[PDB]
UniProtKB/TrEMBL annotation:
Keywords: Glycoprotein, Glycosidase, Hydrolase, Signal. The active site is at E376 (nucleophile). Homodimer. This is beta-glucosidase. Belongs to the glycosyl hydrolase 1 family. Gene3D superfamilies: Glycosidases. The lineage of its organism: Eukaryota, Metazoa, Ecdysozoa, Arthropoda, Hexapoda. It comes from the Eukaryota. It comes from Neotermes koshunensis. The gene is NkBG.
């Protein structure tokens, strides 16, 4: 039993638009912040790589559907490129080519018995909106609403699973370094908090929009996908446990407390620590933006499910480190990795499968067991089809998730592996491979070929169980 998927549980795979599509300026698509980063700042990216072509999924979407069908995916999570649909960011111009492209993909998926799950925003903000300041500028909440309306109107008759945002904890970091994630702005501890604030507002507007303009007719569900690492106390002390709770509240709670709790608002520890630190460093005003009571009420409850992106764990101990100002410094935890944990091709990603079960339990307890869809989980290497490390990563993480479900009563409802194919891994370019299908980036045809992990995941999807040879 502990090795069998619940009957209704949905299994599939995931991608993101900039990471796979290419066709960056084709047929009316406008520029986004990743076009800008990779074109203007190739020194920020391994190999000076760009997403200009990537997997060429703009042209090759039927091949993506073919491999999804071979895999036996029940669900395909993909994102929509804002600037492909609204080239100017604002809703004055709708690019019919972008409408047609996503309709073609959606229709191809449905004709092959695969359910679309659509992420509205996976990091590719139109440059015209970044030029207003991007996420730190609250005007983007209304712009996000208007973008979502175009998506619901055009696609919501066929798409019944939506995520507003993906991994805002990561993309807010684009406002915390001059050389980092797009738009590569150096406002740590100030502009990243403003970005989060706008994102939360935007998410809430999009959810209310669905309720007001679309839900009765379309009958779908709207969530948000939050990334979070498990943080294991470095020792059993109460103080180290306190530091790990700080980590959860500063990383997951920042987004989830306003939306998923009865109280709403930011976590108290976030408000209090940033207030104190801001005062101590001479600011008149806290660096943390505030919600009014009316805003707290508007934002809380804006969810039909919680998306989780889970990859790894850290060790946390009591203390403070990091630059002043920064969110890491504000969080009051000293973070490390255990040298004993298996490594990947990504410096930040160690293999700690039991951390997944711990995280799922933390979420269950903090948020009253919301329905949780694992929207990303996966592993990097540098290449190879005999990807034993990735196979082990998946089988162990899925075992841990199944224990969370069956032993711990966590309401996990679906899982999409990150990623369907090797793709453009942001600042790492094509150097880090997260796919279950390999892609030859030197071959203009970008053929997709299955790795061992794709074969094992197909076996899991077909049998609906962890195969005996992978059991403890
Ligand atoms: O790297 C950012 C990141 C860190 C920890 C948890 C989730 C994350 O974010 C996810 O990670 C994937 C692998 O890096 C990216 O390819 C996905 O686009 C991103 O959504
Ligand atoms: O987040 C990186 C970092 C910054 C300053 C000091 C120590 C650190 O690990
Ligand atoms: Cl101890
Ligand atoms: Cl066997
Ligand atoms: Na329209």
């Amino acid at each position: 039993t502990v090795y069998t998927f619940p009957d209704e549980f949905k299994l599939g795979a995931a991608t993101a638009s900039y990471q796979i599509e290419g066709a960056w300026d084709e047929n009316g698509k406008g520029p986004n912040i990743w076009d800008t980063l990779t074109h203007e700042h190739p020194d920020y990216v391994v190999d000076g790589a760009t997403g200009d072509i990537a997997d060429d999924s703009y042209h090759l979407y039927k091949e993506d559907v073919k491999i999804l069908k071979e895999l036996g995916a029940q669900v395909y999570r993909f994102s929509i490129s804002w600037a492909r649909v609204l080239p100017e960011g604002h809703d004055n111009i709708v690019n019919q080519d972008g409408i047609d492209y996503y309709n073609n993909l959606i229709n191809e998926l449905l004709a092959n018995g695969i359910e679309p799950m659509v992420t509205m925003y996976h990091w590719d903000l139109p440059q015209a909106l970044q030029d207003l300041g991007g996420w730190p500028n609250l005007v983007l909440a209304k712009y996000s609403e208007n973008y979502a309306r175009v998506l619901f109107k055009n696609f919501g008759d066929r798409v019944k699973l939506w995520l507003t945002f993906n991994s805002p904890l990561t993309f807010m970091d684009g406002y915390a370094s001059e050389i980092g994630m797009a738009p590569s702005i150096n406002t740590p501890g100030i502009g990243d908090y403003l970005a989060a604030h706008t994102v939360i507002h935007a998410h809430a507007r999009i959810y209310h929009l669905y309720d007001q303009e679309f839900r009765a007719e379309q009958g779908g569900k709207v969530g948000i996908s939050l990334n979070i690492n498990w943080c294991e106390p470095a020792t059993n002390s109460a103080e180290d446990r306190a530091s790990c709770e700080n980590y959860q509240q500063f990383n997951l709670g920042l987004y989830a407390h306003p939306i998923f709790t009865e109280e709403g608002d930011y976590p108290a520890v976030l408000k209090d620590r940033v207030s104190r630190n801001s005062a101590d460093e001479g600011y008149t005003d806290s660096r943390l933006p505030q919600f009014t009571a009316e805003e707290v009420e508007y934002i809380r409850g804006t969810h039909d499910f919680l998306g989780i992106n889970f990859y790894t764990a850290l060790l946390g101990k009591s203390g403070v480190e990091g630059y002043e100002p920064s969110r890491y410094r504000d969080s009051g935890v000293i973070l490390t990795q255990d040298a004993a944990w298996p490594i990947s091709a990504s410096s930040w990603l160690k293999v700690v499968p039991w951390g997944f079960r711990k995280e799922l339990n933390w979420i269950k307890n903090e948020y009253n067991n919301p329905p949780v869809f694992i929207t990303e989980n996966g592993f990097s290497d540098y290449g190879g089809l005999n990807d034993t490390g990735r196979v082990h990563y998946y089988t162990e993480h899925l075992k841990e998730m199944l224990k969370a479900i069956h032993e711990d009563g966590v309401n996990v409802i679906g899982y999409t592996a990150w990623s369907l194919m090797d793709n453009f891994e942001w600042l790492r370019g094509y150097s880090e491979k997260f796919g279950i299908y390999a892609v030859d980036f030197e071959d203009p045809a970008r053929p997709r070929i299955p790795k061992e992990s794709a074969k094992v995941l197909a076996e899991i999807m077909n049998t609906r169980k962890i195969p005996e040879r992978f059991r403890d």
